Amino acid sequence: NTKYNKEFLLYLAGFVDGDGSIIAQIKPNQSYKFKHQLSLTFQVTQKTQRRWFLDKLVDEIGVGYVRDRGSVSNYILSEIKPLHNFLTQLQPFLKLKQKQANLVLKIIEQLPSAKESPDKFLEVCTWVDQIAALNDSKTRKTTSETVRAVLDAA
Amino acid sequence: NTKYNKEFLLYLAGFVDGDGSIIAQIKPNQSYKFKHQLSLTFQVTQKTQRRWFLDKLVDEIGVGYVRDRGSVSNYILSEIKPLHNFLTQLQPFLKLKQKQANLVLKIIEQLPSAKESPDKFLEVCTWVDQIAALNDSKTRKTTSETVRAVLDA
DNA sequence: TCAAAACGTCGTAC
DNA sequence: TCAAAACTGCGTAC
DNA sequence: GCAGTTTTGA
DNA sequence: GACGTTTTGA
Ligand SMILES: [Mn+2]
Ligand SMILES: [Mn+2]
Ligand SMILES: [Mn+2]
Ligand SMILES: [Mn+2]
Ligand SMILES: [Mn+2]
After folding, report:
1. What is the assigned CATH class of domain B1-153?
2. EC (chain B)?
3. How far apart are CA A136 and CA A134, in angstroms?
């Protein structure tokens, strides 16, 4: 797998702790087996005027993309297995967001097996709670005990 | 005159490009020669719940302090001498605030010199102009031209 | 007078 | 059904 | 920053 | 985040 330079990871770890975001979501979607999608997102926000910085991350991380949303842009990394590679090498240098990073890694490994059982699928949903608790969460809606609800009504 | 660990500078440079501010101001104060104080501030902002992060900074930079303001806390470094030392070491790793880092570095070297002539001081004031230019400035008032605007008297 | 601190404001860039 | 994308809403932490 | 809701496209 | 205003203390 792609092995990133230490000096890059050190700088990048500091920037992510500043303006990055590591997100786990339970997305209500009827298309899905347990009526919910597990979504992981690594994200670095920056004012579009400085877009070049985010675009250079695409070059250096070697995967991911940049979306421009008006006056702000975001580098996005959603593909679950490059995510795993990248967060694995970054996680040792993160101070503020290390616990989130390690959970997202954990969820990724326990995700094939999260499709087998509603009991297991609930356990992983629990982990997502923990990630959102560690974040500066303000507008979250779908907890694991929301999944719990409509896994009983089924 | 401390030498900071390189693995530390690399990380801190990232965090600073993220939530840090390298501020140069011109402060209308009658007490001063030309009725203005040149002020330099290095600062890192964080929600107070993470004040421990800012604490650690103070410990590792060895100089500077932490201020609270309700929900938000700040690491602050203003003393001209260690500011020069620290920025000189940090500067080569910055990517978004490297320009500001250096302009400050050079305003400092010129500080005693700028206490000499009206012509010189306000040249330094246009270096301060440039620093707000690079920053996400939104509420600036005293620019370098309200400086000799006053020196028009 | 001067370095440096202390306290407030304001608009985003996250 | 699923991984992944696309887009919007929103309240701060800067 | 950290979510939400929706859509793609096999 | 990036300021402004004001005060300390020799
Ligand atoms: Mn931050
Ligand atoms: Mn929280
Ligand atoms: Mn930033
Ligand atoms: Mn920020
Ligand atoms: Mn600007």
Report:
1. alpha beta
2. 3.1.-.-
3. 7
